[PDB]
RNA sequence: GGUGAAAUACCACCCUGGCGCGGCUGGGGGCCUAACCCUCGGAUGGGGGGACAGCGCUUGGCGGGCAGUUUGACUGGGGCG
């Protein structure tokens, strides 16, 4: 629970095949937001089951609650 | 606040289903017509069929018409047993 309140999130994929999670705060330091986008990049790449074959992380995007929609390239 | 398995703003990504249009390629329907076949009927020009069927290779399938072999041993014979 320590983590739960110091800096928690976690994963889970919904039906058809997607994951949902907070990777930073709005006004938060940009670089930082990058740091978290990555946090997700890693943890995810990890969880990524071995029953893959091709384009696994198909579409990865930074989007906001009630705001913009920006697909992203978490490779760099 | 509530109703529930789920909660409603609005901004996200992802499916079931029907249509917009854009690349690939699958089915196919029409004279032609110049290769091609037959051509013509008395001349290398007319005509008749025509991208077909001829025909090269590769595909799969029939296929005794043919081919080359085979189709056991024991056992008061050999077979049948």
Swiss-Prot record:
It comes from the Bacteria. Disulfide bonds: none annotated. Signal peptide: none annotated. Belongs to the universal ribosomal protein uL1 family. The L1 stalk is quite mobile in the ribosome, and is involved in E site tRNA release. Binds directly to 23S rRNA. Part of the 50S ribosomal subunit. This is Large ribosomal subunit protein uL1. It comes from Thermus thermophilus. The lineage of its organism: Bacteria, Thermotogati, Deinococcota, Deinococci, Thermales. The chain holds residues 154 to 229 of 229 of the full protein.
């Amino acid at each position: 629970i320590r983590e739960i309140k110091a800096g928690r999130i976690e994963f889970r994929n919904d039906k058809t095949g997607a994951i949902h999670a907070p990777v930073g705060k709005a006004s938060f330091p940009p670089e930082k937001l990058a740091d978290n986008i990555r946090a997700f990049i890693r943890a995810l790449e990890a969880h990524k089951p071995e029953g893959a074959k091709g384009t696994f992380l198909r579409s990865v995007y930074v989007t906001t609650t009630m705001g913009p929609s920006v697909r992203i390239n978490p490779h760099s």
